Design a protein around this ligand. Structure first.
Ligand code: HEM
Ligand SMILES: *[C@@H]1O[C@H](CO)[C@@H](O[C@@H]2O[C@H](CO)[C@@H](O)[C@H](O)[C@H]2NC(C)=O)[C@H](O)[C@H]1NC(C)=O
Ligand code: NAG
Ligand code: NAG
Ligand code: BR
Ligand code: CA
Length: 595
């Protein structure tokens, strides 16, 4: 059992044995092991890291070196052969609104982030990785296969930099390389409030004693707040459009501006915090700012938990929901609530649910203006279309009445992501998220497909014929065992996602097991779970059961027509009801009769 307890990219820290709130860092959730689930620590290893040298080098690094006697295929080659498709007609999910995709991304962002190594940002290092395609140290470029249109138009590779690792950022040879999780493992609204003290404070409005989050001061949304702008230059949101020059937003999580709809969902979440803090004050006008901020924060975290566990997860996991996530029995302090490395890849199932276009809709849920539907790629890091082009209401209707992409074994990831991705240093709409997913699954040292089938107690196909029955699909299996020569070598991202979905849910068996297990643990291992006896009063809990994403939308925008079940596919006006019929969060059980 070779290592004990290293801990470098963290500060302190010491714990507050009631202090009815979460820390910002996630520390002091577990009493016995107060770092467990804290941000800026190693991702959990559910299985030992698997690298080409047993320590750090990703499979595929050394040309000569095989995985189980075979070369691992180029990540872009797998992407082109298997992941890509041309025809967007037919690809939509008849049963899930766009919001289903979106909440996926939100939750994902509350739970995990393995950021690239920052070492030598001011070095020829990016210049040598991006310009020359030279693999070495933290440069692990995605090379194009010989028939790739991108060879002709973009150059020899897409640059790709390896994920940071814990202890120090300088090269690691004594135990295996462990990637960092930069946000809190608890489902806690950290994407709203920050996972570091240094950002948590900046986000806040300390100017007034009202516990508000800072809001944008440049611009409004029909009297509704936007998120403050980031400061930093050079800003990729400015970069898209140097005429409009609108910076990215500043949120609790750094990726909040990555696509317009994510920014939209972040905006709704911040408004809800200020709305709660207002209500709490109106009702407790002795509470101070700090009380008001924690108390709103606490409620918002419970809302994110409830929405996720009651409304999202059952329609991801389907028939497997009760198997992995049985109803709640209380806090269990032996549970490890840390996000595992593999989860951060299993949750990328969301990538096949992203459709090629986004729509703005007006109050009749009709096209809003002349160019109301746009290609997804024009919306990466695009804040200008919000501030300058209608606010969030039109985008939110789109969320409600357009549908997610459906995962499809022949049509996996839209070319909007597979060919047109924009990354905030690289200056082009030319990257391939799928290729990146696969390179990163190698970067992070993932065990292969069958390792994971084994972990979850499933069959482990060894032959083409085996893989055909598991996937149900002769030709997908054939392509996968032309590229990988054995299902042992298939990258978990693409193996998990290749499996047909389970009844009433949107992922295959292997992923339902990986996801289901993670979420059970993040709920059961959390001292501040909304439903844990003690955390909220019973009366407070009776109010919280009534929350809905419909109501969030009603309380925070000027939309008055919403569906009752926002994740299901909905059509206007048949499936839409007026906001007055929706349950409200009743805040009266938060009144502090101290008088
Ligand atoms: C257009 C919408 C989206 C875009 C543009 C996008 C883009 C990206 C990018 C660029 C990365 C980093 C990849 C890397 O360097 O390895 C990433 C990672 C990730 N994505 Fe998405 N994504 C989208 C939607 C979603 C959805 C719907 C989900 C889940 C339902 C999701 C789940 C994740 C997760 C869990 C990761 C890893 C985060 C971490 O580092 O822990 N994404 N995505
Ligand atoms: C960059 O943003 C600008 C301003 O936000 C966009 O310009 C608007 O687009 C149409 C003309 O194409 C007009 O209705 C608006 O008056 C334009 N405003 C200005 C100041 O030009 C422009 O489309 C965006 N450009 C790109 C390349 O994304
Ligand atoms: C802080 O709150 C005050 C009044 O409550 C408001 O006028 C001001 O605009 C807020 N500042 C920020 C930066 O959100
Ligand atoms: C808590 O979790 C542990 C380990 O997962 C399990 O063995 C134990 O039974 C659980 N304890 C309770 C009281 O539920
Ligand atoms: Br992202
Ligand atoms: Ca979190």
């Amino acid at each position: 059992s070779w290592e004990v307890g290293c801990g470098a990219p963290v500060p302190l820290v010491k714990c507050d044995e009631n202090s009815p709130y979460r820390t910002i860092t996630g520390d002091c959730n577990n009493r016995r092991s107060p770092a467990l689930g804290a941000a800026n620590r190693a991702l959990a290893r559910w299985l030992p890291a698997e690298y080409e040298d047993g320590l750090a080098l990703p499979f595929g690094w050394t040309q000569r070196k095989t995985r189980n006697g075979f070369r691992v295929p180029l990540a872009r080659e797998v992407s082109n052969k298997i992941v890509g498709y041309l025809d967007e007609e037919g690809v939509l999910d008849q049963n899930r609104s766009l919001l289903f995709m979106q909440w996926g991304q939100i939750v994902d962002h509350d739970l995990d982030f393995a950021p690239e190594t920052e070492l030598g940002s001011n070095e020829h290092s990016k210049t040598q990785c991006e310009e020359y395609c030279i693999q070495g140290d933290n440069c692990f470029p995605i090379m194009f296969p010989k028939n790739d249109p991108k060879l002709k138009t973009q150059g020899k590779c897409m640059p790709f930099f390896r994920a940071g690792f814990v202890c120090p950022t300088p090269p690691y040879q004594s135990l295996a390389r462990e990637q960092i999780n930069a946000v809190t493992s608890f489902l806690d609204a950290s994407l709203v409030y920050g996972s570091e003290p240094s950002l948590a404070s900046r986000l806040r409005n300390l100017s007034s004693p009202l516990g508000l989050m800072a809001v944008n001061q440049e611009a409004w949304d029909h009297g509704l707040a936007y998120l403050p702008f980031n400061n930093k230059k050079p800003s990729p949101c400015e970069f898209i459009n140097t005429t409009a020059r609108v910076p990215c937003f500043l949120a609790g999580d750094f990726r909040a501006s990555e696509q317009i709809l994510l920014a939209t969902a972040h905006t709704l979440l911040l408004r809800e915090h200020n709305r709660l803090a207002r209500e709490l004050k109106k009702l407790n006008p002795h509470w101070n700012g700090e009380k008001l901020y924690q108390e709103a924060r606490k409620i918002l975290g419970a809302f994110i938990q409830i929405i996720t566990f009651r409304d999202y997860l059952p329609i991801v996991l389907g028939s497997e929901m009760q198997k992995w996530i049985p109803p709640y029995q209380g806090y269990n302090n032996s549970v490890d609530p840390r996000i595992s490395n593999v989860f951060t890849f299993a949750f990328r199932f969301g990538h096949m649910e992203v459709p090629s276009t986004v729509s703005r809709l007006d109050e009749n849920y009709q096209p809003w203006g002349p160019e109301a539907e746009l290609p997804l790629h024009t919306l990466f890091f695009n804040t200008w279309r919000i501030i300058k082009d209608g606010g969030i209401d039109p985008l939110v209707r789109g969320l409600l009445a357009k549908k997610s992409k459906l995962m499809n074994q022949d049509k996996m990831v839209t070319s909007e992501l597979r060919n047109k991705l924009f990354q905030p240093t690289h200056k082009i709409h030319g990257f391939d998220l799928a290729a990146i997913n696969l390179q990163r699954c190698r970067d992070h040292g993932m065990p292969g497909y069958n390792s994971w089938r084994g972990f979850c107690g499933l069959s482990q196909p060894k032959t083409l014929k085996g893989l055909q029955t598991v996937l149900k699909n002769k030709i997908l299996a054939k392509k996968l065992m032309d590229l990988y020569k054995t299902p042992d070598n298939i990258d978990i991202w693409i193996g998990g996602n290749a499996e047909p979905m389970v009844e009433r849910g949107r992922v295959g068996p292997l992923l339902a097991c990986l996801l289901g297990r993670q979420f059970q643990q993040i709920r059961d291992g959390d001292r501040f779970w909304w439903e844990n006896p003690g955390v909220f009063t019973e009366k407070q809990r009776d109010s919280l059961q009534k929350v809905s994403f419909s109501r969030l939308i009603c309380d925070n925008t000027h939309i008055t027509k919403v569906p009752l079940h926002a994740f299901q596919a909905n059509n206007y006006p048949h499936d839409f009801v007026d906001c007055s019929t929706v349950d409200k969060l009743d805040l009266s059980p938060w009144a502090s009769r101290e008088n």
